[PDB]
Symmetry: C2
Subunit: 133 residues, 2 copies
Amino acid sequence: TRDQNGTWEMESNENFEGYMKALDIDFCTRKIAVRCTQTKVIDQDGDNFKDKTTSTHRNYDVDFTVGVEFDEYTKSLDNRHVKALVTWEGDVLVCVQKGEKENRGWKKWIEGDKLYLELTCGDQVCRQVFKKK
Amino acid sequence: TRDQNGTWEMESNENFEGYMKALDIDFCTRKIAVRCTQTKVIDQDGDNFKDKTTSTHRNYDVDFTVGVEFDEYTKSLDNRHVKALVTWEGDVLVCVQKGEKENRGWKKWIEGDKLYLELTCGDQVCRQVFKKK
Ligand SMILES: [Zn+2]
């Protein structure tokens, strides 16, 4: 059928590597690009097409208990092992990530409708904000 | 509140570049990570936490009419300029991407609840399959 309208979720991606290498995309980018699963949204009106494609990768699982030390392998970032410990400070969840990097950790808290996550490493602070679906 | 349960969508990410650089993440990775939007699913039972995080980025937004050649800038892959012409062959969309690369194009068709996208560059063929959601 000529009807391609709809939302489509990638289930297989054979030889993405060879196609990308043929397109002269550098290996470091190809290694990342094969990990993510594409979603395609097609809006079709006769012979007129709109195609919006995004791609998603899975970062990590992290399971923990407040007050219990745990090894965190940061596979979605720098691929290091840290000994993490999460504690409450009021309503703020505070994590110290013990390891090679000095002053590494994060803070996580709710402010009404929004989740705030502050990541630190050395003198660098990254501030993230999330909203509910 | 200490209740962080929920599906949290990133709306802001300040200085993720500087944080990643402090972690010695190399530029090839930082340049894609900086334009991802995270989805954080938190399941929390008292002091026990599970956090599943994914990240999504844009790939392409194409708008075309069958039979009308259009200019395409392949930002999601090699960022080249091609002149794309899409025609029907039966119920298969067939595209030639005229440009610097030889024998570049793609075919796109439906079978059942699946969408097939065959991408070709030179002697390399990538076969993607998508399931209708
Ligand atoms: Zn990706």
